[PDB]
Design a protein around this ligand. Structure first.
Ligand SMILES: Nc1nc2c(ncn2[C@@H]2O[C@H](COP(=O)(O)O)[C@@H](O)[C@H]2O)c(=O)[nH]1
Ligand SMILES: Nc1nc2c(ncn2[C@@H]2O[C@H](COP(=O)(O)O)[C@@H](O)[C@H]2O)c(=O)[nH]1
Ligand SMILES: [Zn+2]
Ligand SMILES: [Zn+2]
Lengths: 115, 115
């Protein structure tokens, strides 16, 4: 069946499952992480379903560039003293939801610890 | 004076300062992190000098998309069991070098700890 009917982040992006919205437009949806690891922890997703960064193609690279530009616009507004962007791909990175999502982290001097 | 003459990552990208090269082409340069926080820890930079993600514009967003596509090509080769991509912007994120660089991290089940 379809991603629209099955994917948790597709549903959050269509407001079929609630979230605390930070920003949205026709292309992207940004909302607060439910289990934050920093005092500011925002997820930014495309509304369209793309499973991970490994699904970027030479053909959709421009759109992912646009998503990253919008990530920066959100980051510089919400985190004027700096922010970290994180994307997790697959098992070793702990990727849970298979709908690409950029983490925006900030609000403190963020740790840089061995992983 | 010019970035080519002053910026550590511009110089590494032109091989004016040594690094352990992972991949390069006319657009990007990827090399091993000197102080790794994971068993695979690669930095990917554009050869052109762009200071941080906050310098992405609606006009260069396509090129940054291309850089991120190439990050994914490097990640999926070097880290077939998954990888994490990190970008640090400004003080709170600990951004040291003001030449945009994507961290590719992997080679183990990566921690997800409070920052
Ligand atoms: N707001 C919200 N965040 C979620 C939900 N499900 C998962 N998350 C967050 O999504 C993130 C998934 O990141 P991943 O580990 O896949 O990179 C986690 O930080 C997790 O807490 C949800 O239903 N609502
Ligand atoms: N290979 C190499 N890595 C460097 C050099 N200088 C800084 N680095 C790495 O560059 C990264 C900078 O990341 P930042 O904290 O700015 O995101 C750090 O992980 C640091 O160890 C260098 O001269 N050579
Ligand atoms: Zn989805
Ligand atoms: Zn530079």
């Amino acid at each position: 069946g379809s991603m629209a009917d099955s994917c948790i982040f597709c549903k959050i992006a269509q407001k079929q499952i609630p979230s605390t919205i930070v920003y949205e437009d026709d292309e992207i949806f940004a909302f607060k992480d439910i289990n934050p690891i920093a005092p500011i922890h925002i997820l930014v997703i495309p509304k369209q379903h793309i499973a991970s960064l490994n699904e970027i193609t030479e053909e959709n690279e421009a759109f992912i560039g646009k998503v990253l530009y919008k990530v920066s616009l959100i980051g510089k507004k919400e985190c004027p003293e700096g922010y970290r962007v994180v994307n997790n791909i697959g098992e070793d990175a702990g990727q849970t939801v298979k709908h690409i999502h950029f983490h925006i982290l900030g609000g403190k001097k963020l740790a840089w610890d061995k992983l």
